[PDB]
Chain A
Amino acid sequence: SALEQFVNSVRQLSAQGQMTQLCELINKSGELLAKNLSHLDTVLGALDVQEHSLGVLAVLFVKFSMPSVPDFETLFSQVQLFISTCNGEHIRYATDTFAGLCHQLTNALVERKQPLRGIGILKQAIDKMQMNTNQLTSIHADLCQLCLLAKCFKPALPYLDVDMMDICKENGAYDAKHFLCYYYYGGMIYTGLKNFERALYFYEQAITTPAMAVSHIMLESYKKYILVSLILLGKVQQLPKYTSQIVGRFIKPLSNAYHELAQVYSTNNPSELRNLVNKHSETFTRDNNMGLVKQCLSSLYKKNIQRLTKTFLTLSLQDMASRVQLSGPQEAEKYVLHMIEDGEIFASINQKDGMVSFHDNPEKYNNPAMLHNIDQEMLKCIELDERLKAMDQEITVNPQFVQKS
């Protein structure tokens, strides 16, 4: 009964042009639309998906908000059609309902077996709500979660490489649980592609959130940070000073095994590390981060050779094999070949007399390629400076300012 008047009022209020009345009336009338369960004809009706985007958005959110939805495929197709053929700018008013609908959709996809099916759908929503490509939103966290749980890392790379400046408040619904999760699942997705620098950067950014408490994902992010820092560097990178004092009192003594790993790794001894990792296997397996700790074990054999590079011009395979303790000259050739193949070292194998020679002449810094690299760095520093100048100019105009001085 009331559905006819509701849809008619939506019609004339959308035709009139002014918008906020629709959003303020739909969000306070959910009880009216939640007591019918027969408005499937009202979902389509004469409500075209182009003009009446908010009216069908509210209907879909209400329909999908009830627990234990009987029909999954129909709502999946409806939301796919709505997202694909959406308006583009009118959704940017009712951002909270959009975020809730997308979170419920990701939960409903991940709940049964498959996160993959929604991936593309989510990658269609991102571009239709964020103002700019460099604009973090809560839906990025859901996209990263679905990507990580679907074991298809490549499709999420374009939305992660770009930096994110400014975060949408989305009507006070973007709490810390949607910002801490994103920068941690980014670390997950990068640590699986062996891009350790950006993974470490994301983990460090996730660590230094302002928080007067202890969260769950913070502990795992700290553990993976302490692993990745040992992986890439030879030491634990010092956390930035702008960190909350909670990490210095609670989380630090809770994770003792990883600090013991760091302490043993600092001695460059590849024998006691095996015993230490064998002894503490239970906690590492419970944390389900197996694979990032055996990499730490393998990192010593890759770092000792680089350390020897600074001292010996050339070596016999037997002497260096005894020095690094890999138990065999034959495997030393394999490790040196892997190192020279991956480009971390500049060495040459000379098998006529059992030789590894260390050519420390990588570059002269006079080719046009170096000039091109310098130019590329300049065109990024210039963009950064322009962005800071624009932000400062925007700040110097706010009416809240000009009166504090």
Chain B
Amino acid sequence: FSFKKLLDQCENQELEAPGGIATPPVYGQLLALYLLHNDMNNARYLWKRIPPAIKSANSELGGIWSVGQRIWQRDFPGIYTTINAHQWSETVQPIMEALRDATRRRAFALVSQAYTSIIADDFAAFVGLPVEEAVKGILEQGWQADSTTRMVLPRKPQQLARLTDYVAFLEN
């Protein structure tokens, strides 16, 4: 819930500026939070708004834009391998873990909603975790597995005041 007010205050700090350029931490936090909320258009426009000097000065923005492009292309293993390839600063650390587990939950929801029979390897690639613990876990939540063929088969998951207002409006 603090992410919403953080976004509000960061956007306010970006809107008012001596020359329209805020601190690099502000850019990093704003772009990371835009990636967290799955709002790609605003994140891309913010990235294009960044002046070349400040974005070239720090490779943190470059890496976060790389993971943003990975999100754009919807390559989930790319998401899980890019997010753990660089060592990140403190100001952006406690938001990317939320990004990671939110994307994990979204991937689980997508698999449960769309796929009816998925090979265990592809499901493990989507989740980003080894096959064994994912298989046991989905066994507990209630997804039937299949050995030998190694297949996963997930299962899909006051009035009267309004009425008198309506009658009063219609009676004219």
A193 to B44, CA, bound (A): 11
A-B contact pairs, 5 of them (CB 8 A): A152-B15, A153-B42, A338-B74, A348-B115, A351-B122
Beyond A120-B15, A378-B166, whether A192 also contacts B45 by CB under 8 A is: yes
Q: Which of A155, A192, A382 contacts B15 (CB 8 A)?
A: A155
Tell whether, in the assembled complex, residue A357 and residue B42 are in contact, meaning their CB atoms are under 8 Å apart.
no
Q: Scoring B residues 108 to 121 as 1 if CB is less than 8 Å from chain A, else 0, what string do you get? A: 00100111111100
Q: Closest A-chain residue to B47, C-beta based?
A: A151
Contact size range, A = 20 to 34
Q: Which of B11, B122, B151 contacts A352 (CB 8 A)?
A: B151
Tell whether, in the assembled complex, residue A150 and residue B49 are in contact, meaning their CB atoms are under 8 Å apart.
yes
A120 to B12, CA, bound (A): 10
A122 to B36, CA, bound (A): 30
Residues on B with C-beta less than 8 A from A116 are: 20, 49
Residues on A with C-beta less than 8 A from B11 are: 154-155
Give the distance to chain A from B103, nearest Cβ to Cβ, in Å. 13
A116 to B16, CA, bound (A): 9
New A-B contacts (7) at CB < 8 Å, excluding given A152-B49, A155-B11, A349-B118: A152-B45, A193-B41, A351-B118, A357-B116, A375-B162, A378-B166, A385-B169
Beyond A114-B20, A154-B42, A193-B41, whether A349 also contacts B15 by CB under 8 A is: no
A351 to B116, CA, bound (A): 8
B48 located at the interface, meaning its Cβ lies under 8 Å from any Cβ of chain A in the complex: yes
Interface residues of chain B, those whose CB is within 8 Å of chain A, are 11, 15-17, 19-20, 41-42, 45-46, 48-49, 74, 110, 113-119, 122, 151, 162, 166, 169
A114 to B49, CA, bound (A): 11
Q: Which of B15, B19, B48 contacts A151 (CB 8 A)?
A: B48
Tell whether, in the assembled complex, residue B113 and residue A351 are in contact, meaning their CB atoms are under 8 Å apart.
no
Considering the complex, which residues of chain A in the window 84-141 have a beta carbon less than 8 Å from any beta carbon of chain B? 114, 116-117, 119-120
Give the distance to chain B from A194, nearest Cβ to Cβ, in Å. 6
A339 to B17, CA, bound (A): 41
Give the distance to chain A from B37, nearest Cβ to Cβ, in Å. 12
Beyond A350-B116, A351-B117, A357-B116, whether A114 also contacts B74 by CB under 8 A is: no
Considering the complex, which residues of chain A in the window 144-162 have a beta carbon less than 8 Å from any beta carbon of chain B? 150-155
Tell whether, in the assembled complex, residue B169 and residue A151 are in contact, meaning their CB atoms are under 8 Å apart.
no
Tell whether, in the assembled complex, residue B16 and residue A120 are in contact, meaning their CB atoms are under 8 Å apart.
yes
Tell whether, in the assembled complex, residue B116 and residue A348 are in contact, meaning their CB atoms are under 8 Å apart.
yes
Give the distance to chain A from B110, nearest Cβ to Cβ, in Å. 6
Tell whether, in the assembled complex, residue B113 and residue A340 are in contact, meaning their CB atoms are under 8 Å apart.
yes
A337 located at the interface, meaning its Cβ lies under 8 Å from any Cβ of chain B in the complex: yes
A117 to B19, CA, bound (A): 7
A367 to B113, CA, bound (A): 20
Tell whether, in the assembled complex, residue B115 and residue A349 are in contact, meaning their CB atoms are under 8 Å apart.
yes
Q: Scoring A residues 228 to 268 as 1 if CB is less than 8 Å from chain B, else 0, what string do you get? A: 00000000000000000000000000000000000000000
Q: Which of A120, A192, A357 contacts B41 (CB 8 A)?
A: A192
A114 to B51, CA, bound (A): 11
A360 located at the interface, meaning its Cβ lies under 8 Å from any Cβ of chain B in the complex: no
A149 to B101, CA, bound (A): 36
Tell whether, in the assembled complex, residue A340 and residue B20 are in contact, meaning their CB atoms are under 8 Å apart.
no
- Which 6 A-B pairs have CB atoms at the shortest separation, nearest pair first? A352-B117, A116-B20, A340-B114, A151-B49, A350-B116, A348-B116
Residues on B with C-beta less than 8 A from A348 are: 114-116
Residues on B with C-beta less than 8 A from A375 are: 162
Q: Closest A-chain residue to B151, C-beta based?
A: A352
Q: Which of B16, B17, B46, B116 contacts A349 (CB 8 A)?
A: B116
Give the distance to chain B from A111, nearest Cβ to Cβ, in Å. 15
A51 located at the interface, meaning its Cβ lies under 8 Å from any Cβ of chain B in the complex: no
Tell whether, in the assembled complex, residue B119 and residue A351 are in contact, meaning their CB atoms are under 8 Å apart.
yes
Q: Closest A-chain residue to B153, C-beta based?
A: A352
Q: Scoring A residues 193 to 205 as 1 if CB is less than 8 Å from chain B, else 0, what string do you get? A: 1100000000000
